């Protein structure tokens, strides 16, 4: 399916701390970061997208248009401007985010009761999974 809507919450987290490194996150960010439950909120009315990630430390906000191109200014993790794209590919729904780092972006999907997240950067993949609040 590509509905994605609900409150998910953070069952796994593998390599979190080797993408962090590969977006080069500060040291003492990135030791907090991977011990922290990630809870994400998405809102999907559409093409359009709403969502949060939040632990109790951190939050992401991003809100985006599928196939519609955005400028984003990512000052809150590695401070970086990028072009970024949303698209489906099949029941996929994959960022790209273009510029200084190679292979940035992530893709999320649905297999049965679970989100799955793939973060990437550089040669680096993170992966989270998510079961529905």
Do not use: P
């Amino acid at each position: 399916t590509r509905d994605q809507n609900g409150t998910w919450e953070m069952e796994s987290n593998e390599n979190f701390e080797g993408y962090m490194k590969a977006l080069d996150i500060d040291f003492a960010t990135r030791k907090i970061a991977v011990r922290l439950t990630q809870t994400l909120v998405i809102d999907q009315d559409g093409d359009n997208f709403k969502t949060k990630a939040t632990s109790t430390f951190f939050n992401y906000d991003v809100d985006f248009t599928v196939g519609v191109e955005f400028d984003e200014y990512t000052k809150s993790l590695d401070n970086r401007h990028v072009k970024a794209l949303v698209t489906w590919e099949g029941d996929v729904l994959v960022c790209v985010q273009k510029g200084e780092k190679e292979n940035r972006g992530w893709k999320k999907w649905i297999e049965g009761d679970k989100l799955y997240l793939e973060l990437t950067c550089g040669d680096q993949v993170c992966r989270q999974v998510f079961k529905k609040k």
